[PDB]
């Protein structure tokens, strides 16, 4: 099997990239795809860049080109659920755009025409992720992750997300775009990210200071997840 | 005679007229998108129906570029008019595209800019000139300028006000142009947006859209046909 992995920033893909053996690099459409094996498992790691379009472009390339069996979106996120603290894990059971609005025509807030109002992550991928979380003794929350093309740091931006998606556990900028692409190609996906901040008026400083920590936690989780999917 | 022109429209109504005119037409269904190949007035074209929104347009544009390698991309369809002299049916030609809903300002990026990208994506000068030549020849009313995109249908109120305040110079607003420009930019492919006005993005936009979408589609499609011809023969 081939496992696809997508991270947005250098920090979020560098540790995994350093571990890929029989590594080959593909530079294309402004993205980088690293192919090879992670602890014996065939993977394809994509550094997509930040934002929905960058992520959609990279996911599309990855699916069309390398044709992985499942997609795992790694990286950092702004924590919204009460029990989350920096470094904690968020596992998507679903992804929705918090900034899409075509309600003028009767679509659900966050829903784009031609798409489900939310994209569901794969149950097996979620089960495997949670088994790893238990085995590594990590604090994690499973639930709705919302994406938009904006960095959230309190004020109006956070307020609007709370209103439309009070049950969202985390917010970031690529997951739902990746889920949307996977949905169109019928590819299972799961988002496994780590908290770099709590999306408030202090998230800039928190993100700056804890991104490396969040990237590491999510990377270790992905490493464990890949191994679990490949060997049980 | 060796040029392949890529054309991207989001909705059925926006691509149907051009599609019916493609000779030796074939249909490719990939990634939830539909691409029609063949010739338009003898010029090789690849017409994609992308679906609505930034991600749907990005996915489609990426497929079209990777799969059909067109030499240039023309984004067709409707838009909400923002510049004063625009009436329903008029043409808007992009000289630039920017996301009106992207905000990473907390980190010092320009409003609308995503990290790793230029704050705005510039349309091709030759494609712009050709489109304007077509405009002068069809004797249509048009405006050239900044087109801004977002994943929201602008219906007046705060959505509209925020846009006018952040991009006072924007001539129109829609939902796919900048995502297509972004993908084209990353692939180094020349692009131009030539859309037509279906509404003025105000509280009436919902009704105006339902009523004049066909008119915008007709006017934009005429422009695209003329542009394809212009680009291949002069
Ligand atoms: C530098 S923009 C923030 C990047 O980290 C993720 N991230 C982390 C925290 C966070 C937040 N509070 N709001 C939005 N995106 C966030 C996003 O997916 C994007 O790739
Ligand atoms: C049914 S969503 C609107 C569709 O038509 C375009 N459009 C036209 C007018 C308009 C507006 N006022 N606001 C946003 N998108 C608009 C968009 O790019 C999208 O494909």
UniProtKB/Swiss-Prot annotation, chain A:
This enzyme's EC code(s): 3.2.2.9
Top EC class for this record: hydrolase
Pfam family, one: PNP_UDP_1
Alphabetical keyword list: Amino-acid biosynthesis, Hydrolase, Methionine biosynthesis
Binding residue positions for substrate: 78, 152, 173-174
Keyword Cell inner membrane tagged: no
Entry-linked SUPFAM superfamilies: Purine and uridine phosphorylases
Pathway per the UniProt entry: Amino-acid biosynthesis; L-methionine biosynthesis via salvage pathway; S-methyl-5-thio-alpha-D-ribose 1-phosphate from S-methyl-5'-thioadenosine (hydrolase route): step 1/2
Single GO biological process annotation from the record: purine deoxyribonucleoside catabolic process
Top-level taxon of the source organism: Bacteria
Subunit-level organization: Homodimer.
Name of this chain's protein: 5'-methylthioadenosine/S-adenosylhomocysteine nucleosidase
Species of origin: Escherichia coli O6:H1 (strain CFT073 / ATCC 700928 / UPEC)
